[PDB]
Design a protein around this ligand. Structure first.
Ligand SMILES: [Ca+2]
Ligand SMILES: [Ca+2]
Ligand SMILES: [Ca+2]
Length: 269
């Protein structure tokens, strides 16, 4: 299974001098526009807010994208005017990631291509995955923890044993805080195998819990659940634990096997 080469934190700050594409009164009066941006990294897509009637938009939004050692992967950005029909094009940008890794931290205005005018203000942070916990304390403080992610949670769903029944069709749902993802379904078995990998962004591992619920997908019935304070990982080697876990609201011998690893996101120079 692929593992991330790092995390790219994208500050979608502002743009200036964009192309006005709206016109009042049958096109007599030249007007401004309603800019917003579409940001792409690999399969990950991000959409900024629409700011109305302004060619120097200030979004101050921030997105977090996973980056792997895959070929030539790039940061793609397109700006549009929100119109009631087809949104008019306000310019585009293409940044080489392998270049961004090299610089670690950028703060620059970029001139949009394929438009007569327009500039975009970005601050890019290349965060690497740290296996030791040595810098968590510093990363939490820089974020100003009192939000964006201070860590990643990478977890492996191996299998479960001896689940309650008649037989069920087991599926697992994991949700660190509000982010939630689901495994695939196994059918008519009390011994499911998934061998699936999942990744979650983490604001603060000292506060957040991983919640795991096993369900029978056919029927509303629950098959057990599990809470794992991520803090417990903080005291494990390479912030990774691998064991069988007891399920609650389940059988007495019902368990779930996982590998769970934490990585602190760090900007170095
Ligand atoms: Ca328009
Ligand atoms: Ca418009
Ligand atoms: Ca539209």
């Amino acid at each position: 299974f692929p593992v991330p080469k790092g995390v790219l934190r994208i500050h979608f700050i502002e743009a200036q001098d964009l192309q006005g594409k709206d016109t009042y009164l049958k096109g007599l009066v030249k007007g401004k526009s309603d800019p917003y941006g579409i940001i792409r990294v690999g399969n990950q897509i991000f959409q900024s807010r629409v700011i109305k009637e302004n060619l120097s938009p200030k979004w101050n939004e921030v997105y977090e994208a996973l980056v792997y050692e895959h070929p030539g992967q790039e940061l793609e950005i397109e700006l549009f005017d929100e119109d009631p029909d087809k949104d008019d094009f306000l310019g585009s940008l293409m940044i080489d990631l392998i270049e961004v890794e090299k610089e670690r931290l950028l703060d620059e205005w970029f001139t949009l291509d394929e438009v007569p005018k327009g500039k975009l203000h970005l601050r890019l942070e290349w965060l690497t995955l740290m296996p030791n916990v040595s810098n968590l304390d510093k990363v939490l403080t820089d974020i100003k923890a009192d939000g964006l992610s201070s860590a990643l949670l990478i977890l492996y769903l191996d299998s479960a044993r001896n689940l309650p029944s008649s037989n069920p069709n087991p599926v697992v749902q994991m949700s660190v805080g509000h982010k939630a993802q689901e495994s695939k379904i196994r059918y008519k078995t009390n011994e499911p195998v998934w061998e699936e990998n999942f990744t979650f962004f983490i604001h603060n591992p000292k506060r957040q819990d991983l919640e795991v619920e096993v369900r029978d997908e056919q029927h509303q019935c629950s098959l057990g659940n599990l809470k794992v304070p991520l803090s417990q990982l903080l005291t494990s080697e390479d912030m990774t634990v691998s064991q069988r876990f007891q399920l609650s609201n389940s059988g007495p011998n019902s368990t779930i096997k996982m590998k769970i690893a934490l990585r602190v996101l760090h900007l170095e120079k």
